[PDB]
PDB file of C-alpha atoms and ligand atoms in Angstrom:
ATOM      1  CA  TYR L   1     111.403 115.369  58.066  1.00  0.00           C
ATOM      2  CA  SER L   2     107.853 112.868  57.405  1.00  0.00           C
ATOM      3  CA  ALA L   3     105.505 111.253  59.805  1.00  0.00           C
ATOM      4  CA  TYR L   4     105.069 108.245  58.649  1.00  0.00           C
ATOM      5  CA  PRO L   5     107.319 105.682  56.235  1.00  0.00           C
ATOM      6  CA  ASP L   6     107.192 105.422  52.144  1.00  0.00           C
ATOM      7  CA  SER L   7     104.298 108.055  52.665  1.00  0.00           C
ATOM      8  CA  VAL L   8     103.233 109.502  48.701  1.00  0.00           C
ATOM      9  CA  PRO L   9     101.719 112.419  48.259  1.00  0.00           C
ATOM     10  CA  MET L  10      98.023 112.012  46.573  1.00  0.00           C
TER      11      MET L  10
ATOM     12  CA  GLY I   7      74.219  98.618  67.100  1.00  0.00           C
ATOM     13  CA  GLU I   8      76.494 100.980  65.592  1.00  0.00           C
ATOM     14  CA  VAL I   9      75.881 103.106  62.486  1.00  0.00           C
ATOM     15  CA  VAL I  10      79.071 104.347  60.777  1.00  0.00           C
ATOM     16  CA  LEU I  11      78.723 108.336  59.931  1.00  0.00           C
ATOM     17  CA  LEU I  12      82.191 108.280  58.368  1.00  0.00           C
ATOM     18  CA  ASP I  13      85.362 106.711  57.604  1.00  0.00           C
ATOM     19  CA  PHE I  14      88.728 107.926  56.999  1.00  0.00           C
ATOM     20  CA  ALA I  15      89.824 104.917  56.261  1.00  0.00           C
ATOM     21  CA  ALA I  16      87.582 103.295  54.199  1.00  0.00           C
ATOM     22  CA  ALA I  17      86.691 106.123  51.917  1.00  0.00           C
ATOM     23  CA  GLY I  18      90.112 105.855  50.172  1.00  0.00           C
ATOM     24  CA  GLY I  19      91.039 108.870  50.250  1.00  0.00           C
ATOM     25  CA  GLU I  20      87.722 110.386  48.617  1.00  0.00           C
ATOM     26  CA  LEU I  21      86.274 112.415  50.976  1.00  0.00           C
ATOM     27  CA  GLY I  22      87.548 116.134  50.133  1.00  0.00           C
ATOM     28  CA  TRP I  23      88.932 116.963  53.163  1.00  0.00           C
ATOM     29  CA  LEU I  24      89.532 120.972  53.196  1.00  0.00           C
ATOM     30  CA  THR I  25      93.812 122.202  54.716  1.00  0.00           C
ATOM     31  CA  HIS I  26      94.408 124.702  56.642  1.00  0.00           C
ATOM     32  CA  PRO I  27      96.809 126.648  54.679  1.00  0.00           C
ATOM     33  CA  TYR I  28      96.428 125.249  51.816  1.00  0.00           C
ATOM     34  CA  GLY I  29      99.574 124.455  51.004  1.00  0.00           C
ATOM     35  CA  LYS I  30     102.710 123.377  53.298  1.00  0.00           C
ATOM     36  CA  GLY I  31     100.595 122.378  57.047  1.00  0.00           C
ATOM     37  CA  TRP I  32      98.642 118.828  56.339  1.00  0.00           C
ATOM     38  CA  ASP I  33      98.685 116.612  53.292  1.00  0.00           C
ATOM     39  CA  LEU I  34      97.155 113.745  51.986  1.00  0.00           C
ATOM     40  CA  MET I  35      99.588 110.504  51.914  1.00  0.00           C
ATOM     41  CA  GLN I  36      98.580 107.369  50.857  1.00  0.00           C
ATOM     42  CA  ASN I  37     101.312 103.877  51.689  1.00  0.00           C
ATOM     43  CA  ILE I  38     100.632 100.824  49.538  1.00  0.00           C
ATOM     44  CA  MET I  39     103.852  98.783  51.663  1.00  0.00           C
ATOM     45  CA  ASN I  40     101.019  96.739  53.229  1.00  0.00           C
ATOM     46  CA  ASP I  41      98.021  94.118  51.446  1.00  0.00           C
ATOM     47  CA  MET I  42      96.135  97.522  52.222  1.00  0.00           C
ATOM     48  CA  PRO I  43      96.292 100.767  51.432  1.00  0.00           C
ATOM     49  CA  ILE I  44      97.012 103.223  54.007  1.00  0.00           C
ATOM     50  CA  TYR I  45      95.718 106.277  53.879  1.00  0.00           C
ATOM     51  CA  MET I  46      96.196 109.634  55.806  1.00  0.00           C
ATOM     52  CA  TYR I  47      97.037 113.386  56.629  1.00  0.00           C
ATOM     53  CA  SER I  48      99.803 114.119  57.743  1.00  0.00           C
ATOM     54  CA  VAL I  49     101.762 117.145  59.040  1.00  0.00           C
ATOM     55  CA  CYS I  50     105.900 116.994  60.109  1.00  0.00           C
ATOM     56  CA  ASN I  51     106.904 120.984  60.684  1.00  0.00           C
ATOM     57  CA  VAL I  52     108.703 120.852  63.675  1.00  0.00           C
ATOM     58  CA  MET I  53     111.454 122.765  63.521  1.00  0.00           C
ATOM     59  CA  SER I  54     109.593 125.825  62.493  1.00  0.00           C
ATOM     60  CA  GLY I  55     108.283 126.245  66.271  1.00  0.00           C
ATOM     61  CA  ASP I  56     104.763 128.868  64.812  1.00  0.00           C
ATOM     62  CA  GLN I  57     102.828 126.109  63.455  1.00  0.00           C
ATOM     63  CA  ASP I  58      99.020 126.680  63.204  1.00  0.00           C
ATOM     64  CA  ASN I  59      97.921 123.997  60.612  1.00  0.00           C
ATOM     65  CA  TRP I  60      93.733 122.624  59.954  1.00  0.00           C
ATOM     66  CA  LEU I  61      92.096 120.318  58.856  1.00  0.00           C
ATOM     67  CA  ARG I  62      88.244 120.123  58.172  1.00  0.00           C
ATOM     68  CA  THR I  63      86.169 117.222  57.265  1.00  0.00           C
ATOM     69  CA  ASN I  64      83.332 117.119  54.859  1.00  0.00           C
ATOM     70  CA  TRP I  65      79.934 117.927  55.988  1.00  0.00           C
ATOM     71  CA  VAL I  66      78.628 114.890  58.029  1.00  0.00           C
ATOM     72  CA  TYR I  67      74.651 114.365  58.204  1.00  0.00           C
ATOM     73  CA  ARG I  68      73.816 113.700  62.001  1.00  0.00           C
ATOM     74  CA  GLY I  69      70.200 111.905  60.724  1.00  0.00           C
ATOM     75  CA  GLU I  70      69.181 110.972  64.180  1.00  0.00           C
ATOM     76  CA  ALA I  71      72.210 111.065  65.763  1.00  0.00           C
ATOM     77  CA  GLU I  72      72.475 112.116  69.529  1.00  0.00           C
ATOM     78  CA  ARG I  73      75.694 112.090  71.320  1.00  0.00           C
ATOM     79  CA  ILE I  74      78.083 110.776  67.852  1.00  0.00           C
ATOM     80  CA  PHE I  75      81.779 108.271  69.494  1.00  0.00           C
ATOM     81  CA  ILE I  76      84.974 110.158  67.142  1.00  0.00           C
ATOM     82  CA  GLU I  77      87.805 107.081  67.006  1.00  0.00           C
ATOM     83  CA  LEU I  78      91.404 108.335  65.930  1.00  0.00           C
ATOM     84  CA  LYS I  79      93.996 106.745  64.807  1.00  0.00           C
ATOM     85  CA  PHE I  80      97.333 107.832  64.481  1.00  0.00           C
ATOM     86  CA  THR I  81     101.348 107.855  65.266  1.00  0.00           C
ATOM     87  CA  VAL I  82     103.135 110.729  66.352  1.00  0.00           C
ATOM     88  CA  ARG I  83     107.146 110.806  66.055  1.00  0.00           C
ATOM     89  CA  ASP I  84     109.495 111.152  69.111  1.00  0.00           C
ATOM     90  CA  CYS I  85     110.691 115.013  68.923  1.00  0.00           C
ATOM     91  CA  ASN I  86     114.028 113.726  70.508  1.00  0.00           C
ATOM     92  CA  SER I  87     114.325 112.321  66.981  1.00  0.00           C
ATOM     93  CA  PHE I  88     114.566 115.812  65.369  1.00  0.00           C
ATOM     94  CA  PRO I  89     117.712 117.314  65.836  1.00  0.00           C
ATOM     95  CA  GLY I  90     117.451 120.883  67.557  1.00  0.00           C
ATOM     96  CA  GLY I  91     113.420 121.078  67.882  1.00  0.00           C
ATOM     97  CA  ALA I  92     113.943 120.704  71.776  1.00  0.00           C
ATOM     98  CA  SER I  93     111.330 123.774  71.960  1.00  0.00           C
ATOM     99  CA  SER I  94     110.063 124.010  67.997  1.00  0.00           C
ATOM    100  CA  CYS I  95     108.697 120.151  67.938  1.00  0.00           C
ATOM    101  CA  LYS I  96     105.442 119.142  70.151  1.00  0.00           C
ATOM    102  CA  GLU I  97     103.685 115.515  70.802  1.00  0.00           C
ATOM    103  CA  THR I  98     100.304 116.155  70.805  1.00  0.00           C
ATOM    104  CA  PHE I  99      97.390 117.581  68.316  1.00  0.00           C
ATOM    105  CA  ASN I 100      93.985 119.216  68.871  1.00  0.00           C
ATOM    106  CA  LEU I 101      90.258 117.612  68.020  1.00  0.00           C
ATOM    107  CA  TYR I 102      87.908 120.069  67.133  1.00  0.00           C
ATOM    108  CA  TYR I 103      84.472 120.061  66.004  1.00  0.00           C
ATOM    109  CA  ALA I 104      81.356 121.735  65.020  1.00  0.00           C
ATOM    110  CA  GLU I 105      76.849 122.200  64.352  1.00  0.00           C
ATOM    111  CA  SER I 106      75.676 123.662  61.378  1.00  0.00           C
ATOM    112  CA  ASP I 107      72.892 123.261  59.386  1.00  0.00           C
ATOM    113  CA  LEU I 108      74.271 123.676  56.214  1.00  0.00           C
ATOM    114  CA  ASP I 109      77.570 123.177  54.486  1.00  0.00           C
ATOM    115  CA  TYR I 110      80.171 126.153  54.684  1.00  0.00           C
ATOM    116  CA  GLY I 111      82.242 124.548  51.785  1.00  0.00           C
ATOM    117  CA  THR I 112      85.601 125.934  51.197  1.00  0.00           C
ATOM    118  CA  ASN I 113      84.397 128.600  54.132  1.00  0.00           C
ATOM    119  CA  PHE I 114      86.745 127.226  57.069  1.00  0.00           C
ATOM    120  CA  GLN I 115      86.240 129.683  59.570  1.00  0.00           C
ATOM    121  CA  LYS I 116      88.258 128.399  62.989  1.00  0.00           C
ATOM    122  CA  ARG I 117      86.073 130.922  65.041  1.00  0.00           C
ATOM    123  CA  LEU I 118      82.938 128.322  65.048  1.00  0.00           C
ATOM    124  CA  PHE I 119      84.665 125.035  66.019  1.00  0.00           C
ATOM    125  CA  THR I 120      85.071 123.741  69.715  1.00  0.00           C
ATOM    126  CA  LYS I 121      87.518 122.391  71.061  1.00  0.00           C
ATOM    127  CA  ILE I 122      87.051 118.860  72.707  1.00  0.00           C
ATOM    128  CA  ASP I 123      90.229 117.996  73.951  1.00  0.00           C
ATOM    129  CA  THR I 124      93.954 117.736  73.342  1.00  0.00           C
ATOM    130  CA  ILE I 125      95.194 114.274  71.628  1.00  0.00           C
ATOM    131  CA  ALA I 126      97.962 112.607  73.283  1.00  0.00           C
ATOM    132  CA  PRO I 127      99.643 109.248  71.959  1.00  0.00           C
ATOM    133  CA  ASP I 128     100.162 106.549  74.624  1.00  0.00           C
ATOM    134  CA  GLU I 129     103.033 105.426  72.529  1.00  0.00           C
ATOM    135  CA  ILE I 130     105.956 107.811  70.542  1.00  0.00           C
ATOM    136  CA  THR I 131     107.527 106.694  67.459  1.00  0.00           C
ATOM    137  CA  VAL I 132     111.317 106.800  67.846  1.00  0.00           C
ATOM    138  CA  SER I 133     113.639 107.034  65.380  1.00  0.00           C
ATOM    139  CA  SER I 134     115.209 103.021  64.799  1.00  0.00           C
ATOM    140  CA  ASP I 135     111.481 101.730  64.612  1.00  0.00           C
ATOM    141  CA  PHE I 136     110.267 104.333  62.360  1.00  0.00           C
ATOM    142  CA  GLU I 137     113.173 103.822  59.701  1.00  0.00           C
ATOM    143  CA  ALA I 138     112.138  99.817  60.021  1.00  0.00           C
ATOM    144  CA  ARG I 139     109.215 101.138  59.348  1.00  0.00           C
ATOM    145  CA  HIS I 140     107.440  99.257  62.313  1.00  0.00           C
ATOM    146  CA  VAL I 141     106.044 102.202  63.537  1.00  0.00           C
ATOM    147  CA  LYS I 142     103.816 102.210  66.527  1.00  0.00           C
ATOM    148  CA  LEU I 143      99.096 103.254  65.669  1.00  0.00           C
ATOM    149  CA  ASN I 144      97.938 105.251  68.789  1.00  0.00           C
ATOM    150  CA  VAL I 145      93.994 104.620  69.177  1.00  0.00           C
ATOM    151  CA  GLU I 146      91.506 107.654  71.395  1.00  0.00           C
ATOM    152  CA  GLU I 147      88.207 108.130  71.155  1.00  0.00           C
ATOM    153  CA  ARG I 148      86.128 111.169  72.494  1.00  0.00           C
ATOM    154  CA  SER I 149      82.065 111.393  71.924  1.00  0.00           C
ATOM    155  CA  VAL I 150      80.258 114.470  71.995  1.00  0.00           C
ATOM    156  CA  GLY I 151      76.922 115.341  72.067  1.00  0.00           C
ATOM    157  CA  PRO I 152      74.002 115.444  71.863  1.00  0.00           C
ATOM    158  CA  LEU I 153      73.875 117.042  68.689  1.00  0.00           C
ATOM    159  CA  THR I 154      71.265 119.012  67.550  1.00  0.00           C
ATOM    160  CA  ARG I 155      71.512 121.034  64.052  1.00  0.00           C
ATOM    161  CA  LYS I 156      71.554 119.334  60.822  1.00  0.00           C
ATOM    162  CA  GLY I 157      74.611 118.184  60.465  1.00  0.00           C
ATOM    163  CA  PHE I 158      78.555 118.480  61.183  1.00  0.00           C
ATOM    164  CA  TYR I 159      82.268 119.010  60.807  1.00  0.00           C
ATOM    165  CA  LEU I 160      85.345 117.790  62.551  1.00  0.00           C
ATOM    166  CA  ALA I 161      88.477 119.585  62.322  1.00  0.00           C
ATOM    167  CA  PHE I 162      92.416 118.423  63.391  1.00  0.00           C
ATOM    168  CA  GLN I 163      94.630 121.850  64.823  1.00  0.00           C
ATOM    169  CA  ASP I 164      97.838 120.582  64.317  1.00  0.00           C
ATOM    170  CA  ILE I 165     101.052 123.011  66.763  1.00  0.00           C
ATOM    171  CA  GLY I 166     104.335 121.101  65.755  1.00  0.00           C
ATOM    172  CA  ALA I 167     103.955 117.764  65.852  1.00  0.00           C
ATOM    173  CA  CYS I 168     105.179 115.140  64.089  1.00  0.00           C
ATOM    174  CA  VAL I 169     101.993 113.099  62.914  1.00  0.00           C
ATOM    175  CA  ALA I 170     100.087 110.952  60.687  1.00  0.00           C
ATOM    176  CA  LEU I 171      95.939 110.255  61.295  1.00  0.00           C
ATOM    177  CA  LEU I 172      95.504 107.048  59.577  1.00  0.00           C
ATOM    178  CA  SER I 173      91.564 107.066  60.615  1.00  0.00           C
ATOM    179  CA  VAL I 174      88.856 108.706  61.367  1.00  0.00           C
ATOM    180  CA  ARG I 175      85.598 106.591  62.834  1.00  0.00           C
ATOM    181  CA  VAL I 176      82.350 108.551  63.475  1.00  0.00           C
ATOM    182  CA  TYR I 177      79.387 106.345  64.275  1.00  0.00           C
ATOM    183  CA  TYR I 178      76.769 106.547  67.393  1.00  0.00           C
ATOM    184  CA  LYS I 179      74.515 103.837  68.602  1.00  0.00           C
ATOM    185  CA  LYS I 180      71.040 103.178  67.379  1.00  0.00           C
ATOM    186  CA  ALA I 181      67.955 103.608  69.734  1.00  0.00           C
ATOM    187  CA  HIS I 182      67.828 100.223  72.479  1.00  0.00           C
ATOM    188  CA  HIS I 183      64.523  98.184  72.083  1.00  0.00           C
ATOM    189  CA  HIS I 184      62.635  96.860  73.825  1.00  0.00           C
ATOM    190  CA  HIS I 185      62.282  93.273  72.502  1.00  0.00           C
TER     191      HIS I 185
HETATM  192  O1  LIG C   1      89.695 118.854  41.887  1.00  0.00           O
HETATM  193  C1  LIG C   1      90.429 119.711  41.894  1.00  0.00           C
HETATM  194  C2  LIG C   1      89.958 121.401  42.715  1.00  0.00           C
HETATM  195  C3  LIG C   1      89.572 121.142  43.872  1.00  0.00           C
HETATM  196  C4  LIG C   1      90.207 120.996  44.744  1.00  0.00           C
HETATM  197  C5  LIG C   1      89.382 123.491  45.556  1.00  0.00           C
HETATM  198  C6  LIG C   1      90.242 123.938  46.361  1.00  0.00           C
HETATM  199  S1  LIG C   1      89.495 123.560  47.574  1.00  0.00           S
HETATM  200  C7  LIG C   1      90.329 124.992  48.200  1.00  0.00           C
HETATM  201  C8  LIG C   1      90.537 125.517  47.426  1.00  0.00           C
HETATM  202  N1  LIG C   1      89.459 126.596  47.339  1.00  0.00           N
HETATM  203  C9  LIG C   1      88.619 127.019  46.001  1.00  0.00           C
HETATM  204  O2  LIG C   1      87.450 127.417  45.615  1.00  0.00           O
HETATM  205  N2  LIG C   1      89.312 125.934  44.762  1.00  0.00           N
HETATM  206  C10 LIG C   1      90.613 125.191  45.787  1.00  0.00           C
END
């Protein structure tokens, strides 16, 4: 599961 | 009359914070769906049940600051969004700090940190709002001091929540003067 929508690693 | 010492969101993820354990705990992410890029540290290990994930800032020189004000902006997803996570999922995280005269670099020792508070969301983000990209941004502020050493760190402890930390702003108030 993800904490925040449309988040991508940096 | 405020002087900003640390501003995560304005730094564009270039501040080089430290994660422990490195990998599989807090992760640096960006979201570029909006006008302004969004940067964040986030974690969401809500099923495991034995989480102890730490995030530490770079070292901040205190200068003239005595009382520092710490402003956090963050989202927390409803634990009911995750089936079977009744016992493993949490909805809070913990804020810590440490004062020091030198920079410890990559040596993160949580034993040097003092808890400031448990940070809890006034608004949790439920699944329908998450899927529609309507997250609920919470704001919580705490202060500590008087500081007495050359510098300080903040740290964030995740114990099994689904949390995104989007803003960390630390400032102090300049000394009041009689015009
Ligand atoms: O840039 C690139 C390299 C920087 C990342 C180094 C990481 S941070 C924690 C760990 N400890 C080290 O001695 N190096 C890695």
